[PDB]
Design an enzyme around this catalytic site. Sequence first.
Site, PDB file in Angstrom:
ATOM      1  N   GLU A  16      -6.583 -10.496  -1.160  1.00 42.55           N
ATOM      2  CA  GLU A  16      -7.385 -10.183   0.049  1.00 42.55           C
ATOM      3  C   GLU A  16      -8.880 -10.070  -0.236  1.00 42.55           C
ATOM      4  O   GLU A  16      -9.587  -9.203   0.298  1.00 42.55           O
ATOM      5  CB  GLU A  16      -6.872  -8.942   0.762  1.00 42.55           C
ATOM      6  CG  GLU A  16      -5.361  -8.883   0.897  1.00 42.55           C
ATOM      7  CD  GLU A  16      -4.848  -7.759   1.747  1.00 42.55           C
ATOM      8  OE1 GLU A  16      -5.618  -6.944   2.344  1.00 42.55           O
ATOM      9  OE2 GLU A  16      -3.611  -7.626   1.819  1.00 42.55           O
ATOM     10  N   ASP A  26     -12.651  -9.850  -0.566  1.00 46.96           N
ATOM     11  CA  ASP A  26     -13.915  -9.916   0.158  1.00 46.96           C
ATOM     12  C   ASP A  26     -14.849  -8.903  -0.473  1.00 46.96           C
ATOM     13  O   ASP A  26     -14.395  -8.055  -1.250  1.00 46.96           O
ATOM     14  CB  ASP A  26     -13.756  -9.822   1.696  1.00 46.96           C
ATOM     15  CG  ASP A  26     -12.981  -8.616   2.181  1.00 46.96           C
ATOM     16  OD1 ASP A  26     -12.834  -7.596   1.410  1.00 46.96           O
ATOM     17  OD2 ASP A  26     -12.470  -8.627   3.346  1.00 46.96           O
ATOM     18  N   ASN A  83       1.887  -5.384  -3.129  1.00 47.32           N
ATOM     19  CA  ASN A  83       0.484  -5.663  -2.783  1.00 47.32           C
ATOM     20  C   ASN A  83      -0.256  -4.357  -2.480  1.00 47.32           C
ATOM     21  O   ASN A  83       0.264  -3.503  -1.769  1.00 47.32           O
ATOM     22  CB  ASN A  83       0.453  -6.619  -1.570  1.00 47.32           C
ATOM     23  CG  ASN A  83      -0.930  -7.122  -1.237  1.00 47.32           C
ATOM     24  OD1 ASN A  83      -1.549  -7.802  -2.052  1.00 47.32           O
ATOM     25  ND2 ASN A  83      -1.423  -6.808  -0.021  1.00 47.32           N
ATOM     26  N   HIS A 122     -10.552  -5.744  -2.023  1.00 46.84           N
ATOM     27  CA  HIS A 122     -11.545  -5.429  -0.998  1.00 46.84           C
ATOM     28  C   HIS A 122     -12.678  -4.647  -1.648  1.00 46.84           C
ATOM     29  O   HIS A 122     -12.704  -3.388  -1.649  1.00 46.84           O
ATOM     30  CB  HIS A 122     -10.920  -4.632   0.136  1.00 46.84           C
ATOM     31  CG  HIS A 122      -9.958  -5.422   0.970  1.00 46.84           C
ATOM     32  ND1 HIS A 122     -10.353  -6.513   1.720  1.00 46.84           N
ATOM     33  CD2 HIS A 122      -8.619  -5.302   1.135  1.00 46.84           C
ATOM     34  CE1 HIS A 122      -9.282  -7.012   2.321  1.00 46.84           C
ATOM     35  NE2 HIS A 122      -8.222  -6.287   2.004  1.00 46.84           N
ATOM     36  N   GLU A 165       0.837  -1.242   0.000  1.00 43.74           N
ATOM     37  CA  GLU A 165       0.000   0.000   0.000  1.00 43.74           C
ATOM     38  C   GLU A 165       0.852   1.265   0.000  1.00 43.74           C
ATOM     39  O   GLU A 165       0.688   2.138   0.872  1.00 43.74           O
ATOM     40  CB  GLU A 165      -0.987  -0.048   1.149  1.00 43.74           C
ATOM     41  CG  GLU A 165      -1.930  -1.226   1.076  1.00 43.74           C
ATOM     42  CD  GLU A 165      -2.889  -1.380   2.259  1.00 43.74           C
ATOM     43  OE1 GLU A 165      -2.888  -0.526   3.179  1.00 43.74           O
ATOM     44  OE2 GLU A 165      -3.671  -2.357   2.241  1.00 43.74           O
TER      45      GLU A 165
END
Length: 335
Positions: free
Chosen positions: A245, A247, A179, A215, A133
């Site tokens: 990740e 979701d 990432n 996300h 990030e």
Amino acid sequence: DIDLNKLAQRRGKHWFGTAADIPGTAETTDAAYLKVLKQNFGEITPANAMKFMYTETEQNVFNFTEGEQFLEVAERFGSKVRCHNLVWASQVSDFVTSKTWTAKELTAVMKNHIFKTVQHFGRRCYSWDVVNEALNGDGTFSSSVWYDTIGEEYFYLAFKYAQEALAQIGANDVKLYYNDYGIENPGTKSTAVLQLVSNLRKRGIRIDGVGLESHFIVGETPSLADQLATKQAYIKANLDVAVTELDVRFSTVPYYTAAAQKQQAEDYYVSVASCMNAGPRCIGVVVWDFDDAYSWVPSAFAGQGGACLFNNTLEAKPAYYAVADALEGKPCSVC
Ligand SMILES: *[C@@H]1O[C@H](CO)[C@@H](O[C@@H]2O[C@H](CO)[C@@H](O[C@@H]3O[C@H](CO[C@@H]4O[C@H](CO)[C@@H](O)[C@H](O)[C@@H]4O)[C@@H](O)[C@H](O[C@@H]4O[C@H](CO)[C@@H](O)[C@H](O)[C@@H]4O)[C@@H]3O)[C@H](O)[C@H]2NC(C)=O)[C@H](O)[C@H]1NC(C)=O
Ligand SMILES: *[C@@H]1O[C@H](CO)[C@@H](O)[C@H](O)[C@H]1NC(C)=O
């Protein structure tokens, strides 16, 4: 019985994976959780156990107990591990953030952390999320103790040090990833990732892959075509891609009605399908945990939740079955 990982492997992928917050949470001893974990996943990311604040809590004082505890669970289950993460703005030890530094000194702190942590775990890591990030949505560098003190060079140095530390121990096969979130569709942030990759490679520094956090928000998930196009842009640039990740969170209640769950199923479906349709260099899909009762979402965003494949009592949702359909290359049966 369905086993998501078994399905993913039958169709060219390394694995279907999940984060697990072990040993930090009650998952560690939740037998029902652990049974679903073993039954469905071939990869496990440590949600927290390998982060800076759980590996180096005082300067040059390493304690890998949490990470070792996590790895025993993952390895006992035969799962590969995406080690996560070395350099990030969050979850840095207090000795770093609550001290003042020159660029030279903090560079050395960063280097020592990388070398000791990467060499400790060695090849037990499939890959490392080296920098996490690092970008704003406009493609500029985002704020962190690292960036604010060291400047842009921190980013390149992180990868250089990870590469050097692995070379020293004969672990060149451990893959190096960047990432981030917001890099799963076309836009300025994705373009900036490609520029970072170009800049790393011109410096003779290895970067093997990009991690697409994914996300997403129910009803606001980027389309199959956009997600596929973006993965192809990375792959065409000689990057392996992992969805790291995944979701799909609800911005408001209700989370569990028919229409809500159909939309969420479709959103999971297109995200998984984008990896399937990208070919073998989209190596697999990892969800950011799979049980609503342990999800990060509700503590992050008041009133949001329901983001995971299984609900609080570990009932599989339509989204679970939709992921299974996607992994088999079949139309969505529950959307
Ligand atoms: C996972 O675990 C979650 C909880 O964490 C479960 O979520 C529950 O799912 C139920 C089934 O979808 C939900 O119940 C339904 O709610 C509907 C909407 O009802 C409301 O109207 C009431 C009464 O005024 C209000 O309280 C609500 O706020 C809404 O305004 C109902 O229409 C529905 O009831 C009907 O009657 C029969 C029962 O006689 C039902 O069988 C039939 O389907 C019909 O729709 C029903 O009560 C429940 O809201 C929801 N809980 C929460 C907090 O969201 C999941 O079911 C679990 N499983 C999965 C796979 O996720
Ligand atoms: C290392 O961390 C473990 C895991 O929490 C903890 O139990 C222990 O206090 C620490 N050990 C040492 C020697 O500092």
